[model samples]
Target: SSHHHHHHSSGLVPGGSHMGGTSSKGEELFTGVVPILVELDGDVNGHKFSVRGEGEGDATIGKLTLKFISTTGKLPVPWPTLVTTLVQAFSRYPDHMKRHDFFKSAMPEGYVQERTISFKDDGKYKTRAVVKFEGDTLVNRIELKGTDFKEDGNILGHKLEYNFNSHNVYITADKQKNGIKANFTVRHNVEDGSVQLADHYQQNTPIGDGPVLLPDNHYLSTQTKLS
Candidate 1:
């Protein structure tokens, strides 16, 4: 015996595990989830330094800084001589070498940024470096407060270091359209100290900002006043 029949159902079918029938709706769970590690090698005042850190989404943190003098070197016996050398060294470098020239020339395509080279440029007074990653500008700014007097133990020297969290620098979430997120924690380890030359921030300032290079009037004023 052979039997053939058609069955129609308006509700749930008995002994069936699937609910949506053969429709089998398809969906995409995710697109691109990206994370990145950042390593930047740079030179400041002729010292080679690097920044290493990781980030995803809208944040990248790192540690690094330039060097104006070596910590391991012997401290100059005469303070005035040390100050003279500093003045000569800073005067030798052009304004551009102290600021945006290196960044634009080295890896222009990788990063985009603009800011006064140093707050003590002597030409114009500005104290921060604003930067952008890829095409997105960071909401935060890196303020170079112009190195001040920092004491390392009993020894004193002009101190300069990278301020990593200046303005809590990082890209915003909305700007991160690529679905990337990085909880990066970068540190600032690189610090420069003058060669046993220490004084108030004003007098100790580097990059030709220091008053070591005085005006001709300064000499005349002292001579006329004392005599």
Candidate 2:
């Protein structure tokens, strides 16, 4: 199943299990997760094995997996796979490589989403926002907040209690100002495939308006910020 819902961080690979820090690795202290030991020749697809951990309380294995073609090598697993795994596992270790460079190259950039919501009734406008990237990371630091539909035919300032990140999107009302029934949703969608974004609702209490959902964004577009 795809994940359309928003998450905090370090979302592990599907079906894969995390083995915590070095203390967990019975063979040796390892950083990543070995949901299934990749011995000899093995293969993996869309799903990923973790390689981000020990650095922060929140960061852990991520959007990356493997197919061990290594006929032989160091770690018990396939050689090349093990090597790449080690590189990511110890990515935080004082290394010759820059941490940012290593991670950006290792995993998918995930995805960043921003929304254009309606201020009148906390409704989400059909119009959306855009972002730019080199490969998988955002290089330009431009806030999604824009002029108007509400100026210049663009989205304007957003509301409070919003969920903005690199994987999923979330929009919420300023709990302080409106109705209270929350239309809470837990979405799950394929990485890049078009899934209406599975949204499971919660008991209706009161939410001015929960949030608007948009998908299939992410493309190359020129954004001009006014001086």
Candidate 3:
């Protein structure tokens, strides 16, 4: 199902800035819900999964919701299916990637065969990642080497040094009975290039709400284990 809504910015803040400080005037909200099914093959142990989430909200929020879904292995059960789902999800952010044409084209190709690509590196901003399919799951080991570039040009090169890996485990089950969830952690590279633990969340419950918004963001990240 899909619906459209209009958003009027109050322009209350100085410079009429919104949350992200992009533009805060005359914005439209397009919303909808999409039903998904995923099947896995590789190390994930064969599993067929199905997922559905609320699809109505601001564009940014909607995209974020879809990102959470793809990252958590909620839609496609297996690696191949997940890859397909990811491509569709990533396409939604076309404008965001227009500045980095190379990175944009790289996603679809990389998603197919599992490869590593560098986003930026110039002693200041450096980011790279290896994306691959393990069994029925998709794994992304990202190295945010160097400082984070707050702007598009700075993103091309910066130096800070950090490494973060995200593993998405996908499984299949009756949405009403057993649902989906994710556990992940990140390790950072310190000044000495020594890896140190930074943050982690394990076995977080991602309860199936048949398309509902959850706190922290729009879509659900973790769900309660089946009882």
**What do the candidate models score in CA lDDT, each in turn?**
0.20, 0.21, 0.23
Model 3 per-residue lDDT tens digits across residues 1-227: 11111211111111211232222111111123322222222211122333322222223332322222323353211121122222112112222222211112222122222212122231121223343333422234332222332332322222224222222222122234222222222233334564433222211122222231111111112211110
Better of 1 and 2 by TM-score: 1
lDDT of 2: 0.21
Query: Against the true structure, what is each candidate's TM-score?
Result: 0.22, 0.19, 0.20
Candidate 1, residue 28: Cα displacement in angstroms equals 15
Write down the worst ten-residue block by lDDT for model 2.
Answer: 218-227
Which candidate, 2 or 3, has the higher lDDT?
Answer: 3
User: Per-residue lDDT for 25-73 in model 2, tens only?
Assistant: 1112223432322221212221122221111111232222222332322
Q: After superposition, how far is residue 34 of candidate 1 from its true place, in Å?
A: 4.0
Lowest summed lDDT over 10 consecutive residues: which window, candidate 3? 7-16
lDDT of candidate 1 over 1-227, digit per residue (tens): 11111111111112223221221011010012223333333332233333332333210111111112223333312112111111001011122212211111111122222222221211111122222233331111222222222233211332323122111111111122211111211222234432221221111111211111111111000000000
Q: What TM-score should be assigned to candidate 1?
A: 0.22
Angstrom error at residue 77, model 1: 23
